[PDB]
């Protein structure tokens, strides 16, 4: 089952500043009270991060490139954002990755889904509407895990695809800022490593409708792109990354 | 002192002679208590193998791999390991083991090595320069040859550019010839990339079908899931021991620690990159590793 | 910055020690920078190299 | 080369491209190279940060 | 001399099956591998399938279960069964021949057959 | 020439344009067994041996490494580690005679 | 060889090119596609090897 | 020869710089002193050596 959403309002996507967000732990090694230089796929400091809204009538589910990696930020309240779609052609010709977080558990499946043009979940005012794919024939990887999840909640994720491994890094932050990204530093802990082994060039955000037509709950998300660069990370006495330096941002940090 | 100064008479003074180092007393091996065997029977003893252009990749994880049944088998004509010794394969714990299975003819088995050139290396299956793993190949004339000719195995004769390491090309696309496009029959007739092997049992050696399994490893980064048959020893505190934690070897005293490791975090590294703390499998505790007492005499 | 000459000597010596310790992390073209890994992974004919 | 005061004082920096003409890269041409980010002044002071060829830099913005 | 002729083209409903035939005349049908290729109007050529003397059939990964290649060597013919026809399969089909003891040059080609699907 | 007395032409001290030869459409067979056709224009060799003869259409495959046939065993034999390219073309319009 | 014969009995002319890579100098080389010359810019030049 | 002391320093510095440049023309046992010739004539496993 697929449903076209024809009540959207036309608006260009916005842009804003990354500040010093998007830093994740580069490896699984404990380091304490040290300054470590690492060269990896990182999000550049003060970069141009693309801003998408969900407000009522805005419902931003575009087709975005994946490139080398994706930083995904979410200023979320009332749980609209439910998952992501990764793939190349997003049809039954190629193999695609599904990550969903419904009311019970987090499900990761690697199958050849025949995806809808507008994949979505739904909340009735209980969840009783799910229209993401019409079929799933050849499934190789399944992984059921714990639930990962004024705007009250900040969700940071880093998605990387190296050597057939999909690294998802996550950080959950209590915030009370109304509209934009808060300015500060928070190192993203690694959440999960998935052995999917598939080609990914395009990705989709999955949202949830509110029914009482449809109504979009208030949410906002941000997409940034990772580039290969060097960071100087500071590890405190407790092994937590407390500050970072982008080695190629400006001559002072260089 | 006489031996150090190379003289039978030693003048008055202080002389640096050697470096005292306390030796370890016993070896403790700590490995996960996983007991599942790895499905090597489903890989080596499979009835059907895919072609070299569309080689089969099976990810082997979360099991105990008994490599001693591979080397001691006399079936394998070629057992060449790069970056690891086959005898030591039982003693090591790996991560991200990959089994790549395909069928190639006899004289192309030399091309399944890092740094080889040919049709298979460039356009079908490319190994990296820094490849660690094992290439295993054995004759399969009595299974993969038919009297009329076996036509199920095909190789990619030509590609526009060379393949990247561990890159699969299952894409079958019509390609051109030169100065005229492939806009129908009108132009220069269009070449096909995939060519089948001529497998007959009467063929001489070098043309016969050989089954190739390539084992690929990753050297100690994330927590290891594929470990050898080695058993786990008990843990001893505050004594100099030569330990082996998931393939990480070393000598030191294992002590209690106050380092608040995060759940993902397993080990710790100093400036020199030598391991300073480790998380033991089975019990998940965090043991600090302090080098055994040494100094100048 | 009154006592810069002594601090300069201390910094140079500490930096030389830090560089000498850091040089153990380099493999210099070998498969690994750790000797125990080479001794546990390879037979003596190639572990010698 | 990066010419800076202490980070306790300021985060302003100047960049010296040694032996590079300024047309091949607050832009000033010195015999040492091209200095970007420092305002050249006609006054003479004591040398605080040495640039070279008689040019020195100081913080008061960064002047050369 | 060498000649490939085809039959089975026409204007047919979508979902109805088709059987395209490729008759070979002038050369012995053995020791050669036979190809089915299609080209759409305004689009380049797309390879469909391969069949050998053994009977091993290899299909394009892009399209699955739509076609079935059937070789016959008593009368030197090649058959294609097409099932579950979609609207996008309007194309000119070609029968191709490669030699098994060489590179994949497709040598001589069929004149082609026209398949038009409509409702 | 005939296949029992195949003409051997030695190519040396010259620049060889393999692009014209590869792009020629008269050739029904341009099959290489040790090199790549697209890298012929980049590589350099000491000398080239060109062996020219006429055979039957069914015996064209017999000029191959590892191939056993009457032409392979008695007329023209290639080594197992052969490098180079075999080019063959139909000559019905020229060589053939009605008698 | 007759014109009435089909493909397989028709005469085929075969030229076999074999390459030698001995210690002799490589007299036989591929064509040399010279491009246009660009001056006053930092370019990668390849002049006669 | 009045100013030989300064001229010796200038000559030593220039000669050391010239020697450091001339060390680039030595292959040090390799097949060629040019990296591009090695990268174009050999595969990366032996070009690496
Ligand atoms: C929702 O809209 C999309 C895009 O308009 C529809 O996708 C197209 O559907 C037509 C109908 O046959 C096809 O001809 C096109 O090829 C489709 N395009 C793509 C890019 O898929 C989609 O069908 C609509 N959903 C429903 C349920 O009708
Ligand atoms: C971000 O990009 C948009 C267009 O892509 C541009 O108009 C805007 O100025 C950019 N912002 C920054 C801070 O570079
Ligand atoms: C991944 O897909 C894109 C387009 O879908 C393609 O260009 C690219 O080569 C693919 N990469 C791999 C490794 O398959
Ligand atoms: C959540 O998704 C899983 C997997 O599809 C399913 O088994 C489960 O019933 C779902 N829960 C709800 C409440 O929809
Ligand atoms: C993928 O699914 C299709 C249809 O379900 C099937 O025909 C095909 O064989 C499957 N692929 C594999 C590799 O099994
Ligand atoms: C480190 O942890 C201790 C308690 O374990 C805490 O008191 C201290 O503030 C922490 N350090 C920082 C910089 O927050
Ligand atoms: C394959 O079968 C033989 C038959 O006994 C057995 O000895 C061998 O161990 C098997 N191989 C594997 C990998 O299990
Ligand atoms: C085995 O190891 C797992 C972790 O891999 C641990 O959770 C479990 O308690 C261990 N079991 C025993 C009996 O040691």
Numbering used by the authors:
A (entry chain A): 14 to 69, 77 to 145, 153 to 176, 185 to 247, 257 to 298
B (entry chain C): 299 to 595
C (entry chain A), H (entry chain B): 943 to 991
D (entry chain A): 596 to 620, 641 to 675, 691 to 694
E (entry chain H): 1 to 119
F (entry chain A): 348 to 446
G (entry chain A): 497 to 545
Can you provide the manuscript's text about this entry?
To uncover the structural basis for the attenuation of ab6 potency by the L452R mutation, we obtained the cryo-EM structure of the Epsilon spike bound to ab6. A global 3D reconstruction was obtained at 2.45 Å, in which ab6 bound both up and down RBDs, as seen in the WT-ab6 complex. This orientation places the positively charged R452 sidechain in close proximity to a hydrophobic portion of ab6, centered around F58. Thus, the reduced potency observed for R452-containing spikes is likely a result of unfavorable charge and steric effects.
Given its crucial role in the viral replicative cycle, the spike protein represents an important therapeutic target and is a critical antigen in host immune responses. Given the rapidly changing mutational and antigenic landscape of the SARS-CoV-2 spike protein, a structural understanding of spike protein mutational effects and the discovery of broadly neutralizing epitopes is of importance.
